[PDB]
Ligand SMILES: O=C(c1ccc(Cl)cc1)c1c(-c2ccc(O)cc2)sc2cc(O)ccc12
Protein backbone atom coordinates (compact mmCIF):
# COMPACT_ATOMS: atom_id res chain seq x y z
CA UNK A 1 0.00 0.00 0.00
CA UNK A 2 2.84 2.37 0.81
CA UNK A 3 4.29 1.19 -2.51
CA UNK A 4 1.06 1.94 -4.38
CA UNK A 5 0.94 5.37 -2.72
CA UNK A 6 4.55 5.97 -3.76
CA UNK A 7 3.85 4.87 -7.33
CA UNK A 8 0.80 7.11 -7.60
CA UNK A 9 2.64 10.17 -6.26
CA UNK A 10 5.56 9.70 -8.61
CA UNK A 11 3.39 8.90 -11.61
CA UNK A 12 1.36 12.02 -10.97
CA UNK A 13 4.52 14.11 -11.26
CA UNK A 14 5.22 12.50 -14.64
CA UNK A 15 1.70 13.31 -15.84
CA UNK A 16 2.13 16.90 -14.70
CA UNK A 17 5.46 17.10 -16.47
CA UNK A 18 4.04 15.62 -19.66
CA UNK A 19 1.06 17.94 -19.71
CA UNK A 20 3.24 20.98 -19.13
CA UNK A 21 5.79 20.01 -21.78
CA UNK A 22 5.91 22.66 -24.49
CA UNK A 23 8.44 24.32 -26.71
CA UNK A 24 11.83 22.73 -27.14
CA UNK A 25 11.21 20.47 -24.14
CA UNK A 26 8.91 18.55 -26.45
CA UNK A 27 12.03 17.07 -28.01
CA UNK A 28 12.66 15.12 -24.79
CA UNK A 29 9.08 14.27 -23.78
CA UNK A 30 9.63 10.74 -25.06
CA UNK A 31 12.01 10.14 -22.17
CA UNK A 32 8.94 9.97 -19.94
CA UNK A 33 8.03 6.65 -21.61
CA UNK A 34 9.15 3.09 -21.15
CA UNK A 35 11.30 1.79 -23.97
CA UNK A 36 8.24 0.10 -25.49
CA UNK A 37 5.86 2.89 -24.51
CA UNK A 38 3.12 4.01 -26.86
CA UNK A 39 1.63 7.47 -27.27
CA UNK A 40 -0.83 8.85 -29.76
CA UNK A 41 -4.15 10.18 -30.89
CA UNK A 42 -7.03 7.78 -30.46
CA UNK A 43 -9.72 9.81 -32.22
CA UNK A 44 -9.19 10.41 -35.91
CA UNK A 45 -11.22 10.54 -39.09
CA UNK A 46 -10.45 6.91 -39.87
CA UNK A 47 -11.66 5.57 -36.53
CA UNK A 48 -8.24 4.04 -35.87
CA UNK A 49 -5.63 5.49 -33.53
CA UNK A 50 -2.52 7.14 -34.83
CA UNK A 51 -0.15 5.64 -32.30
CA UNK A 52 3.59 6.07 -32.07
CA UNK A 53 5.10 2.85 -30.75
CA UNK A 54 8.33 2.87 -28.80
CA UNK A 55 10.30 5.53 -26.98
CA UNK A 56 12.72 5.94 -29.87
CA UNK A 57 9.88 6.42 -32.34
CA UNK A 58 8.20 8.86 -29.95
CA UNK A 59 11.39 10.91 -29.91
CA UNK A 60 11.53 10.88 -33.69
CA UNK A 61 7.90 11.85 -33.87
CA UNK A 62 8.55 14.90 -31.71
CA UNK A 63 10.23 16.45 -34.73
CA UNK A 64 7.02 16.09 -36.73
CA UNK A 65 4.92 17.19 -33.76
CA UNK A 66 6.96 20.39 -33.59
CA UNK A 67 6.56 20.91 -37.33
CA UNK A 68 2.81 20.36 -37.44
CA UNK A 69 1.94 21.95 -34.09
CA UNK A 70 4.83 24.37 -33.62
CA UNK A 71 3.54 26.18 -30.52
CA UNK A 72 1.14 23.71 -28.96
CA UNK A 73 0.12 24.29 -25.35
CA UNK A 74 -2.11 22.20 -23.11
CA UNK A 75 -4.29 24.46 -20.98
CA UNK A 76 -6.95 24.04 -18.31
CA UNK A 77 -5.23 20.89 -17.09
CA UNK A 78 -7.09 18.77 -14.55
CA UNK A 79 -5.29 15.59 -13.52
CA UNK A 80 -7.30 12.70 -12.15
CA UNK A 81 -5.62 10.02 -10.12
CA UNK A 82 -7.56 6.77 -9.96
CA UNK A 83 -7.79 3.65 -7.83
CA UNK A 84 -5.08 2.21 -10.09
CA UNK A 85 -1.86 4.01 -9.05
CA UNK A 86 -0.61 3.39 -12.59
CA UNK A 87 -3.61 4.91 -14.42
CA UNK A 88 -4.40 8.60 -14.68
CA UNK A 89 -6.86 10.62 -16.71
CA UNK A 90 -6.50 14.26 -17.68
CA UNK A 91 -9.14 16.68 -18.86
CA UNK A 92 -7.72 19.73 -20.58
CA UNK A 93 -7.78 21.90 -23.65
CA UNK A 94 -5.09 22.36 -26.23
CA UNK A 95 -4.29 25.16 -28.61
CA UNK A 96 -1.77 26.11 -31.23
CA UNK A 97 -1.13 26.73 -34.84
CA UNK A 98 -1.80 23.76 -37.06
CA UNK A 99 0.59 23.44 -39.99
CA UNK A 100 -0.39 20.33 -41.88
CA UNK A 101 1.25 19.83 -45.27
CA UNK A 102 -0.98 20.89 -48.12
CA UNK A 103 -3.48 22.68 -45.87
CA UNK A 104 -3.60 26.39 -45.06
CA UNK A 105 -1.96 27.28 -41.77
CA UNK A 106 -4.70 27.37 -39.15
CA UNK A 107 -5.36 27.95 -35.48
CA UNK A 108 -6.48 24.79 -33.74
CA UNK A 109 -8.28 24.66 -30.41
CA UNK A 110 -9.85 21.59 -28.91
CA UNK A 111 -10.95 19.89 -25.75
CA UNK A 112 -9.02 16.76 -24.88
CA UNK A 113 -9.01 13.82 -22.55
CA UNK A 114 -5.75 11.98 -21.97
CA UNK A 115 -5.18 8.52 -20.55
CA UNK A 116 -1.81 7.71 -18.97
CA UNK A 117 -0.91 4.16 -17.98
CA UNK A 118 2.40 3.60 -16.20
CA UNK A 119 4.86 0.78 -15.79
CA UNK A 120 7.81 1.01 -13.41
CA UNK A 121 7.52 4.77 -13.05
CA UNK A 122 7.34 5.71 -16.75
CA UNK A 123 4.51 6.02 -19.25
CA UNK A 124 3.62 2.73 -20.91
CA UNK A 125 0.63 4.09 -22.81
CA UNK A 126 -0.52 7.63 -23.46
CA UNK A 127 -3.71 8.19 -25.42
CA UNK A 128 -5.44 11.44 -26.27
CA UNK A 129 -9.07 11.77 -27.24
CA UNK A 130 -10.80 14.71 -28.88
CA UNK A 131 -13.57 15.60 -31.28
CA UNK A 132 -11.94 15.51 -34.73
CA UNK A 133 -14.57 17.86 -36.11
CA UNK A 134 -12.78 20.77 -34.46
CA UNK A 135 -9.53 19.75 -36.12
CA UNK A 136 -11.33 19.54 -39.46
CA UNK A 137 -12.50 23.10 -38.90
CA UNK A 138 -8.97 24.29 -38.15
CA UNK A 139 -7.86 22.77 -41.46
CA UNK A 140 -10.68 24.29 -43.49
CA UNK A 141 -12.22 20.85 -43.99
CA UNK A 142 -16.01 20.84 -44.21
CA UNK A 143 -17.68 19.09 -41.27
CA UNK A 144 -20.82 17.08 -42.05
CA UNK A 145 -23.94 18.05 -40.15
CA UNK A 146 -26.40 15.54 -38.77
CA UNK A 147 -29.84 16.85 -39.70
CA UNK A 148 -31.74 17.68 -36.52
CA UNK A 149 -35.23 18.45 -37.81
CA UNK A 150 -36.65 15.17 -36.63
CA UNK A 151 -34.88 15.23 -33.29
CA UNK A 152 -36.41 16.80 -30.18
CA UNK A 153 -35.39 20.42 -29.69
CA UNK B 154 -13.32 14.43 6.54
CA UNK B 155 -11.69 11.35 5.03
CA UNK B 156 -14.49 9.14 6.37
CA UNK B 157 -17.04 11.40 4.67
CA UNK B 158 -15.04 11.42 1.45
CA UNK B 159 -14.72 7.63 1.52
CA UNK B 160 -18.45 7.25 2.14
CA UNK B 161 -19.30 9.60 -0.71
CA UNK B 162 -16.99 7.82 -3.15
CA UNK B 163 -18.35 4.35 -2.33
CA UNK B 164 -21.94 5.47 -2.76
CA UNK B 165 -21.25 7.48 -5.89
CA UNK B 166 -19.50 4.51 -7.46
CA UNK B 167 -22.66 2.46 -7.05
CA UNK B 168 -24.60 5.14 -8.91
CA UNK B 169 -22.05 5.16 -11.74
CA UNK B 170 -22.26 1.37 -11.93
CA UNK B 171 -26.04 1.55 -12.04
CA UNK B 172 -26.01 4.24 -14.73
CA UNK B 173 -23.59 2.34 -16.92
CA UNK B 174 -25.67 -0.81 -16.59
CA UNK B 175 -29.02 0.84 -17.25
CA UNK B 176 -30.52 -0.84 -20.31
CA UNK B 177 -33.91 -1.38 -21.87
CA UNK B 178 -36.99 -0.03 -20.15
CA UNK B 179 -34.92 0.90 -17.08
CA UNK B 180 -33.59 3.72 -19.24
CA UNK B 181 -36.93 5.46 -18.68
CA UNK B 182 -35.95 5.95 -15.01
CA UNK B 183 -32.23 6.63 -15.40
CA UNK B 184 -32.93 10.32 -14.82
CA UNK B 185 -33.74 9.51 -11.20
CA UNK B 186 -30.00 9.07 -10.68
CA UNK B 187 -29.61 12.83 -11.19
CA UNK B 188 -30.11 15.82 -8.97
CA UNK B 189 -33.20 17.84 -9.84
CA UNK B 190 -31.03 20.30 -11.76
CA UNK B 191 -28.69 17.62 -13.06
CA UNK B 192 -27.32 17.79 -16.60
CA UNK B 193 -26.45 14.94 -18.92
CA UNK B 194 -25.51 14.76 -22.52
CA UNK B 195 -23.15 14.36 -25.41
CA UNK B 196 -20.17 16.68 -25.40
CA UNK B 197 -18.72 15.72 -28.80
CA UNK B 198 -20.88 16.53 -31.80
CA UNK B 199 -20.48 17.82 -35.33
CA UNK B 200 -21.14 21.39 -34.21
CA UNK B 201 -18.42 21.48 -31.58
CA UNK B 202 -21.03 22.29 -28.93
CA UNK B 203 -22.47 19.85 -26.40
CA UNK B 204 -26.01 18.59 -26.70
CA UNK B 205 -26.87 18.80 -23.02
CA UNK B 206 -30.16 17.81 -21.43
CA UNK B 207 -30.72 20.16 -18.50
CA UNK B 208 -32.72 19.09 -15.48
CA UNK B 209 -33.94 15.77 -14.18
CA UNK B 210 -37.39 16.24 -15.71
CA UNK B 211 -35.95 16.98 -19.16
CA UNK B 212 -33.61 13.99 -18.81
CA UNK B 213 -36.64 11.80 -18.19
CA UNK B 214 -38.37 13.20 -21.25
CA UNK B 215 -35.23 12.69 -23.28
CA UNK B 216 -35.11 9.00 -22.33
CA UNK B 217 -38.17 8.53 -24.53
CA UNK B 218 -36.26 9.84 -27.54
CA UNK B 219 -33.16 7.89 -26.52
CA UNK B 220 -35.14 4.65 -26.47
CA UNK B 221 -36.59 5.41 -29.89
CA UNK B 222 -33.34 6.37 -31.58
CA UNK B 223 -31.07 3.87 -29.79
CA UNK B 224 -33.61 1.15 -29.02
CA UNK B 225 -31.21 -1.59 -27.84
CA UNK B 226 -28.22 0.48 -26.71
CA UNK B 227 -25.73 -1.13 -24.37
CA UNK B 228 -22.50 0.04 -22.81
CA UNK B 229 -19.78 -2.59 -22.81
CA UNK B 230 -16.16 -2.90 -21.76
CA UNK B 231 -17.01 -0.75 -18.77
CA UNK B 232 -14.07 0.47 -16.70
CA UNK B 233 -14.97 2.83 -13.87
CA UNK B 234 -12.30 5.16 -12.51
CA UNK B 235 -12.66 6.68 -9.10
CA UNK B 236 -10.59 9.80 -8.60
CA UNK B 237 -9.14 11.86 -5.78
CA UNK B 238 -12.41 13.81 -5.91
CA UNK B 239 -14.99 11.48 -4.31
CA UNK B 240 -17.63 13.27 -6.39
CA UNK B 241 -15.91 12.85 -9.77
CA UNK B 242 -15.65 9.61 -11.73
CA UNK B 243 -14.53 8.78 -15.24
CA UNK B 244 -15.64 5.75 -17.22
CA UNK B 245 -14.01 4.26 -20.28
CA UNK B 246 -16.25 1.96 -22.24
CA UNK B 247 -17.70 1.11 -25.61
CA UNK B 248 -21.31 1.38 -26.66
CA UNK B 249 -23.27 -0.26 -29.39
CA UNK B 250 -26.72 -0.69 -30.78
CA UNK B 251 -29.04 0.11 -33.61
CA UNK B 252 -29.22 3.76 -34.56
CA UNK B 253 -32.65 4.92 -35.75
CA UNK B 254 -32.24 8.62 -36.40
CA UNK B 255 -35.09 10.43 -38.15
CA UNK B 256 -34.51 10.67 -41.87
CA UNK B 257 -31.44 8.44 -41.89
CA UNK B 258 -31.32 4.76 -42.81
CA UNK B 259 -31.47 2.43 -39.86
CA UNK B 260 -27.90 1.58 -38.94
CA UNK B 261 -25.65 -0.12 -36.44
CA UNK B 262 -23.63 2.29 -34.31
CA UNK B 263 -20.56 1.25 -32.31
CA UNK B 264 -18.18 3.65 -30.63
CA UNK B 265 -15.67 4.14 -27.89
CA UNK B 266 -16.77 6.47 -25.12
CA UNK B 267 -15.47 8.30 -22.11
CA UNK B 268 -17.97 9.43 -19.53
CA UNK B 269 -17.55 12.01 -16.80
CA UNK B 270 -19.79 11.85 -13.74
CA UNK B 271 -19.83 14.62 -11.17
CA UNK B 272 -21.94 14.16 -8.06
CA UNK B 273 -23.71 16.39 -5.59
CA UNK B 274 -25.41 15.03 -2.48
CA UNK B 275 -25.21 11.47 -3.72
CA UNK B 276 -26.76 11.91 -7.17
CA UNK B 277 -25.40 12.87 -10.56
CA UNK B 278 -25.06 16.62 -11.03
CA UNK B 279 -23.32 16.39 -14.40
CA UNK B 280 -22.88 13.49 -16.79
CA UNK B 281 -20.95 14.06 -20.00
CA UNK B 282 -20.07 11.56 -22.70
CA UNK B 283 -17.27 11.99 -25.20
CA UNK B 284 -16.74 10.05 -28.40
CA UNK B 285 -15.43 10.40 -31.93
CA UNK B 286 -18.40 11.66 -33.97
CA UNK B 287 -16.87 10.25 -37.13
CA UNK B 288 -18.02 6.79 -36.07
CA UNK B 289 -21.56 8.06 -35.62
CA UNK B 290 -21.36 9.67 -39.05
CA UNK B 291 -20.40 6.29 -40.46
CA UNK B 292 -23.32 4.60 -38.73
CA UNK B 293 -25.65 7.13 -40.37
CA UNK B 294 -24.14 6.77 -43.84
CA UNK B 295 -22.69 10.29 -43.62
CA UNK B 296 -19.40 10.67 -45.47
CA UNK B 297 -16.45 11.33 -43.15
CA UNK B 298 -13.83 13.77 -44.46
CA UNK B 299 -10.30 12.45 -44.64
CA UNK B 300 -7.26 14.46 -43.65
CA UNK B 301 -4.69 13.94 -46.40
CA UNK B 302 -1.65 12.23 -44.89
CA UNK B 303 0.92 12.46 -47.65
CA UNK B 304 3.09 14.92 -45.75
CA UNK B 305 2.10 13.56 -42.31
CA UNK B 306 4.30 10.69 -41.11
CA UNK B 307 3.68 8.45 -38.12
O1 LIG C 1 -3.49 15.55 -35.30
C1 LIG C 1 -3.01 14.49 -35.65
C2 LIG C 1 -2.13 13.73 -34.71
C3 LIG C 1 -1.71 12.43 -34.96
C4 LIG C 1 -0.88 11.78 -34.06
C5 LIG C 1 -0.49 12.43 -32.91
CL1 LIG C 1 0.59 11.64 -31.81
C6 LIG C 1 -0.90 13.71 -32.65
C7 LIG C 1 -1.74 14.35 -33.53
C8 LIG C 1 -3.38 13.92 -36.94
C9 LIG C 1 -2.53 13.44 -37.89
C10 LIG C 1 -1.06 13.39 -37.89
C11 LIG C 1 -0.39 12.27 -38.35
C12 LIG C 1 0.99 12.22 -38.35
C13 LIG C 1 1.73 13.28 -37.85
O2 LIG C 1 3.09 13.25 -37.85
C14 LIG C 1 1.07 14.40 -37.38
C15 LIG C 1 -0.31 14.44 -37.37
S1 LIG C 1 -3.37 12.80 -39.27
C16 LIG C 1 -4.91 13.16 -38.55
C17 LIG C 1 -6.15 12.90 -39.10
C18 LIG C 1 -7.29 13.26 -38.38
O3 LIG C 1 -8.54 12.97 -38.82
C19 LIG C 1 -7.17 13.87 -37.15
C20 LIG C 1 -5.92 14.10 -36.61
C21 LIG C 1 -4.77 13.77 -37.30
Ligand SMILES: O=C(c1ccc(Cl)cc1)c1c(-c2ccc(O)cc2)sc2cc(O)ccc12
Pocket residue numbers: 145146148151152193194195197198199200204205206218219222286289
Ligand atom coordinates in the same frame (compact mmCIF):
# COMPACT_ATOMS: atom_id res chain seq x y z
O1 LIG D 1 -26.57 11.10 -30.70
C1 LIG D 1 -26.81 12.23 -30.37
C2 LIG D 1 -27.05 12.48 -28.93
C3 LIG D 1 -27.26 13.75 -28.41
C4 LIG D 1 -27.50 13.93 -27.06
C5 LIG D 1 -27.53 12.83 -26.24
CL1 LIG D 1 -27.88 13.03 -24.55
C6 LIG D 1 -27.33 11.56 -26.73
C7 LIG D 1 -27.09 11.39 -28.08
C8 LIG D 1 -26.85 13.31 -31.37
C9 LIG D 1 -27.95 14.09 -31.59
C10 LIG D 1 -29.27 14.03 -30.95
C11 LIG D 1 -29.90 15.18 -30.49
C12 LIG D 1 -31.11 15.11 -29.81
C13 LIG D 1 -31.70 13.88 -29.59
O2 LIG D 1 -32.91 13.78 -28.95
C14 LIG D 1 -31.09 12.72 -30.04
C15 LIG D 1 -29.88 12.80 -30.71
S1 LIG D 1 -27.70 15.27 -32.85
C16 LIG D 1 -26.07 14.70 -33.09
C17 LIG D 1 -25.15 15.18 -34.02
C18 LIG D 1 -23.89 14.60 -34.08
O3 LIG D 1 -22.98 15.00 -35.00
C19 LIG D 1 -23.56 13.55 -33.23
C20 LIG D 1 -24.48 13.08 -32.32
C21 LIG D 1 -25.75 13.64 -32.23
